[PDB]
């Protein structure tokens with residue numbers, strides 16, 4: 002039992018406690034850890050590999066589901082509208098909310114022991130981990146039902162299955178557009194963006210669209226951008242009473258904060274108006290995730306960065322220099338060599354002290370230790386892993402929005418005018434949203450505009 | 466595997482017609498490099514006490530977190546060029562691509 006025990010017996014791989022730990026004084030304790038399920042349970046022939054339970058595609062699978070029985074249970078089957086299920090108990094000031102999930106040991110009930118607020122049900126099981134993730138999901142569910150409602154007025158002869166799929170195909174395309182046109186250039190920086198994501202030529206059925214094992218750990222770089230608080234704002238973008246600067250350790254699994262505290266509106270306002278944490282080689286991750294991850298829902302608080310490293314070991318991922326060689330980058334051997342690569346000898350002496358050799362540095366630790374690429378938020382090694390992965394997802398997606406046959410020329414010309422701020426404009430009571438790029442705009446009122454300046458998606462090109 | 470289709474399957478099955486499961490859910494990850502396990506095929510490095518990795522003892526993940534990651538939350542530097550939305554879109558996007566199950 003890995004939830005409560007410290008014994009290293011399969012499938013448990015607990016994190017042992019070092020001497021003079023800042024938070025954990027009891028050395029007989031541990032940080033709980035379940036080894037990832039193997040693809041081939043109990044085999045002496047195959048080299049242990051792990052499973053991806055989701056579609057690798059950027060197909061909005063976190064909204065619709067990656068398995069047929071969950072997918073049907075996410076839809077409204079009582080009518081022929083093509084809608085996706087809405088919470089039959091609560092509404093965000095009239096607007097739709099995610100439906101609740103039937104869980105045996107519900108962790109969301111443990112956040113406010115008297116609120117009687119369960120987890121939300123969505124295409125991906127992690128919907129209630131943080132109210133900010135719940136708000137993003139809640140925003141996309143409304144967008145699908147908005148699209149399936151405007152498609153019913155343009156094409157009344159259409160059915161429920163014809164409305165669900167057509168709305169699905171719009172939502173998916175929007176996720177790809179926001180991801181590739183606005184998100185990725187800001188992660189890789191212009192040079193790596195050009196190197197790894199050259200302008201789309203067309204879908205190629207020889208490009209493997211799977212998620213590589215390493216990407217599951219490498220994309221965890223996002224942990225360096227995590228701010229220690231959930232920032233909530235009012236109509237005029239001011240700290241909203243109650244709880245305007247709530248710690249992250251008090252919001253994990255706290256779905257009651259959406260249902261009882263202003264809904265998704267003050268949460269979404271603040272993802273736009275507050276700046277993200279910047280990664281610095283002396284400020285890698287906040288102690289709300291490094292010391293109090295899931296504090297009030299389990300026996301002990303977890304250390305997300307340590308889990309990232311234990312997970313890379315569990316997944317048998319090669320070390321830092323092995324990945325540097327894979328990306329075509331040089332592999333340092335000495336502390337002086339590592340100091341030059343990192344452009345920081347203070348950090349190289351530190352990494353050498355633990356690992357002994359740059360060959361042993363865990364892919365996540367080495368990844369986030371590199372200096373950030375110009376106008377980017379990842380170093381050269383991570384820019385390669387993340388870049389290569391996203392290129393395979395794009396070029397190997399038969400239903401990639403830009404590919405011939407997927408959409409009409411006119412539908413593509415319409416889809417191009419979509420933006421995340423305009424989706425907020427349509428699915429919320431938020432009157433003033435971010436000026437594009439939404440991921441760069443972080444200052445109020447300098448980077449903020451009204452709803453009437455952003456044009457909405459014209460679905461005229463979709464009618465029959 | 467149908468000959469003509471207008472929409473994606475829920476599972477991703479049939480997106481690549483030559484290898485129908487590529488990209489589909491509940492399938493093993495691809496590997497860009499071979500795995501490095503303590504016993505060559507399953508035990509993770511740091512499993513057996515005393516067993517070195519590449520000639521050096523294995524550092525405890527929590528010790529690495531403590532000596533390299535830990536910082537005073539008072540000293541947080543805010544990214545003057547990105548919003549908290551940039552962070553949130555990343556986790557949402559991550560939840561479209563991958564989930565690695567464990568037992569219970």
Ligand SMILES: *[C@@H]1O[C@H](CO[C@@H]2O[C@@H](C)[C@@H](O)[C@@H](O)[C@@H]2O)[C@@H](O[C@@H]2O[C@H](CO)[C@@H](O[C@@H]3O[C@H](CO[C@H]4O[C@H](CO)[C@@H](O)[C@H](O)[C@@H]4O)[C@@H](O)[C@H](O[C@H]4O[C@H](CO)[C@@H](O)[C@H](O)[C@@H]4O)[C@@H]3O)[C@H](O)[C@H]2NC(C)=O)[C@H](O)[C@H]1NC(C)=O
Pocket residue numbers: 205206207208392393396
């Ligand atoms: C459709 O996509 C295919 C995959 O594309 C890859 O992924 C995308 C996302 C991009 O990043 C793209 O740049 C990637 O290539 C793509 O097919 C690929 O095409 C190249 C060139 O045709 C192939 O590389 C050649 O491979 C042979 C065999 O060796 C390879 O595999 C072994 C085993 O893993 C490795 O040890 C090697 O490192 C190789 O990777 C090589 O012999 C060959 O190089 C030799 O020849 C050239 C000159 O002729 C010299 O420069 C070299 O020094 C060598 O002497 C190439 O390396 C690649 O294998 C192939 N992959 C697949 C899946 O078929 C395809 O071209 C795309 N089509 C279009 C129109 O876009």
Ligand code: HEC
Pocket residue numbers: 130131134216217218220221222223224227253305308309312552553554555556559563564565566
């Ligand atoms: C942009 C990237 C990104 C962001 C932001 C992000 N994560 Fe992660 N996180 C990941 C990825 C990718 C993984 C691996 C997912 C998988 O395959 O199971 C991960 C895994 C995790 C895990 C499982 C770790 C383990 O080894 O057991 C936890 C817990 C986690 N993240 C929590 C969070 C929380 C809490 C937040 C904030 C609300 C967050 N993450 C934000 C990318 C991110």
Ligand SMILES: Nc1cc([C@H](CCN[C@H]2C[C@@H](c3ccccc3)c3ccccc32)c2ccccc2)c2nn[nH]c2n1
Pocket residue numbers: 104106107108126127128129130295298299564565
């Ligand atoms: N691959 C991952 C995994 C998680 C965690 C997994 C951590 N263990 C959770 C599982 C949780 C639980 C139990 C029963 C019923 C529902 C949820 C439990 C209870 C108490 C302590 C810990 C846990 C996660 C997984 C699924 C939903 C929410 C969070 C992530 N969260 N964001 N991104 C993530 N990526």
Ligand SMILES: *[C@@H]1O[C@H](CO)[C@@H](O[C@@H]2O[C@H](CO)[C@@H](O)[C@H](O)[C@H]2NC(C)=O)[C@H](O)[C@H]1NC(C)=O
Pocket residue numbers: 113115116257261
């Ligand atoms: C759990 O949620 C409830 C909401 O139902 C919170 O209760 C409110 O708290 C404020 C401030 O303490 C009171 O003035 C209100 O009268 C309470 N309302 C209700 C309906 O009880 C409660 O504080 C939350 N619990 C925790 C631990 O934060």
Ligand SMILES: [Ca+2]
Pocket residue numbers: 055056057058059060061062063561562
């Ligand atoms: Ca998906």
Ligand SMILES: [Cl-]
Pocket residue numbers: 088089090100101
């Ligand atoms: Cl319900």
Ligand SMILES: [Cl-]
Pocket residue numbers: 213214215216495496497498
């Ligand atoms: Cl890999």
